[PDB]
Design an enzyme around this catalytic site. Structure first.
Site, PDB file in Angstrom:
ATOM      1  N   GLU A  24      -7.240 -10.635  -3.093  1.00 64.62           N
ATOM      2  CA  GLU A  24      -5.899 -10.949  -3.543  1.00 64.62           C
ATOM      3  C   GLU A  24      -5.225 -11.956  -2.646  1.00 64.62           C
ATOM      4  OE1 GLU A  24      -1.537  -8.747  -4.057  1.00 64.62           O
ATOM      5  OE2 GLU A  24      -3.411  -7.568  -4.193  1.00 64.62           O
ATOM      6  N   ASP A  33       6.645 -13.732  -6.126  1.00 58.73           N
ATOM      7  CA  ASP A  33       5.460 -13.429  -6.914  1.00 58.73           C
ATOM      8  C   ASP A  33       5.603 -14.061  -8.300  1.00 58.73           C
ATOM      9  OD1 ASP A  33       7.276 -11.933  -8.235  1.00 58.73           O
ATOM     10  OD2 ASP A  33       6.390  -9.969  -7.789  1.00 58.73           O
ATOM     11  N   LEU A  45       5.778  -5.845  -2.686  1.00 65.71           N
ATOM     12  CA  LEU A  45       7.074  -6.157  -3.267  1.00 65.71           C
ATOM     13  C   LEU A  45       8.171  -5.669  -2.348  1.00 65.71           C
ATOM     14  CD1 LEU A  45       8.674  -7.047  -5.746  1.00 65.71           C
ATOM     15  CD2 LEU A  45       8.545  -4.685  -6.543  1.00 65.71           C
ATOM     16  N   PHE A 117      -5.085  -1.181  -7.199  1.00 67.36           N
ATOM     17  CA  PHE A 117      -4.160  -2.254  -6.849  1.00 67.36           C
ATOM     18  C   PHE A 117      -4.109  -3.317  -7.931  1.00 67.36           C
ATOM     19  CE2 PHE A 117      -4.235  -0.745  -2.448  1.00 67.36           C
ATOM     20  CZ  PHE A 117      -2.891  -0.629  -2.284  1.00 67.36           C
ATOM     21  N   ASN A 145     -21.816  -1.357 -16.742  1.00 69.53           N
ATOM     22  CA  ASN A 145     -20.783  -1.067 -17.705  1.00 69.53           C
ATOM     23  C   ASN A 145     -19.488  -1.752 -17.318  1.00 69.53           C
ATOM     24  OD1 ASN A 145     -20.633   0.468 -20.169  1.00 69.53           O
ATOM     25  ND2 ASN A 145     -18.943   1.585 -19.181  1.00 69.53           N
TER      26      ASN A 145
END
Ligand SMILES: Cc1ccc([C@H]2c3c(C)nn(-c4ccccc4)c3NC(=O)[C@H]2NC(=O)c2cccc(C)c2)cc1
EC number: 3.2.1.17
Length: 370
Positions: A24, A33, A45, A117, A145
């Site tokens: 990230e 953001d 945040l 997350f 999968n």
């Protein structure tokens, strides 16, 4: 202190924070953001308040010092670890996630937390069959999968690494990513300053991307990399940018360039790019931008957009530094100004430079009407 990272020294050096740093990315300065909200660290945040001082106030309560919107990597890890603890608490009271989480080894738990997350508990809980496979330690089948999922399609490189982590129970995917970026950075780094890519490395970078070094695409890349100054590309910028673009290879970055170009068709993004250019082009030691450099970058970024660019050049080449506000307002001028400048508001507190330009353009404008 409970949050001291020294309390984690018994862990591996690879951990969920370093994992999300790769997947990230880490921001050490407050930023907005996607939703426009003040954030810092790894996705932390701070507030939904439009007030940056409100964000700084939340940050100071969270960090326990007067940060003025800038934190260290260690402080970001402490913030992140609190967020991880909260995510784990959530996982553990989620009937759909707790079984699998409890069942997993520490590395695979990190992979599940990563997923949470990215997509939240409800998102991760949607993976009923893959989570069952994980809980049954059917790692290869889980990997297969998960790769069929929209998750994979949304963030293939992150998702591949998370899947590999589920598949292997190791950090290999992250070790491999770090090494790939290190080895790519090493291709470009300044032999005399490991901390940056210099002119020659930027040239090689452009060559590898088949980009003319004088092309706007190169400046667009610098913008996406939040590069601080032209002719330098710091290690932090390179790594942060490759992370944020989801690229661990030149081929992937090459495929990203059109997407960055497409982002600029938005005037708000073009304005961001345009304003970025000023600080990027300016000498760090200087407060304003040398007119000659400003002209060069104006011609790069405004050609085809500013209908009076040619007259602007003529005007300026007769002139004998450009402050940020004047740079910024030229785009506003460009956006509002009529094709014959008939709607200029002299009382609009435009820079004197633009007032003077409108006066200067008078002979040309009159000749054209003639
Ligand atoms: C090989 C190389 C190409 C371009 C440049 C700069 C540069 C210079 C010195 N004149 N210059 C320019 C100005 C006006 C018109 C056309 C070009 C530019 N255009 C920018 O992208 C400049 N970009 C960067 O430094 C830079 C920084 C970090 C990351 C990345 C990807 C790039 C330097 C070297």
């Amino acid at each position: 202190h409970s949050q001291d990272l020294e309390n984690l020294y018994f862990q591996g050096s690879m951990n969920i924070f370093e994992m999300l740093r790769i997947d990230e990315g880490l921001r050490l300065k407050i930023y907005k953001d996607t939703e426009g909200y003040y954030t810092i660290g790894i996705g932390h945040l701070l507030t939904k308040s439009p007030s940056l001082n409100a964000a700084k106030s939340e940050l100071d309560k969270a960090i326990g010092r007067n940060t003025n919107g800038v934190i260290t990597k260690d402080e970001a890890e402490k913030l992140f670890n609190q967020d991880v603890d909260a995510a784990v608490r959530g996982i553990l009271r989620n009937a759909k996630l707790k079984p699998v989480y409890d069942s997993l080894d520490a590395v695979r738990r990190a992979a599940l937390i990563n997923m949470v997350f990215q997509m939240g508990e409800t998102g991760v809980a949607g993976f009923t069959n893959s989570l069952r496979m994980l809980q049954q330690k059917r790692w290869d089948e889980a990997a297969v999968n998960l790769a069929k999922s929209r998750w994979y399609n949304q963030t293939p490189n992150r998702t591949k690494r998370v899947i590999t982590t589920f598949r292997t129970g190791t950090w290999d995917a992250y070790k491999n990513l770090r090494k790939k970026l290190e080895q790519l950075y090493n291709r470009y780094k300044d032999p005399q300053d490991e901390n940056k890519i210099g002119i020659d490395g930027i040239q090689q970078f452009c060559d590898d991307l088949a980009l003319d070094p004088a092309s706007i695409s190169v400046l667009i890349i610098a913008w996406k990399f939040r590069a601080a100054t032209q002719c330098e590309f710091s290690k932090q910028e390179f790594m942060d940018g490759m992370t944020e673009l989801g690229c661990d290879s030149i081929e992937k970055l090459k495929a990203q360039i059109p997407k960055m170009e497409q982002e600029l068709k938005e005037p708000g993004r073009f304005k961001d790019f345009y304003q970025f250019t000023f600080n990027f082009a300016k000498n760090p030691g200087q407060k304003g931008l040398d007119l000659e450099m400003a002209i060069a970058y104006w011609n790069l970024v405004l050609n085809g957009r500013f209908k009076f660019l040619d007259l602007w050049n003529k005007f300026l080449l007769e002139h004998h530094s450009i402050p940020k506000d004047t740079w910024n307002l030229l785009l506003d001028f460009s956006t509002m100004i009529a094709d014959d400048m008939s709607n200029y508001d002299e009382e609009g507190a435009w820079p004197v430079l633009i007032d003077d330009f409108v006066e200067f353009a008078r002979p040309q404008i009159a000749g054209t009407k003639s």
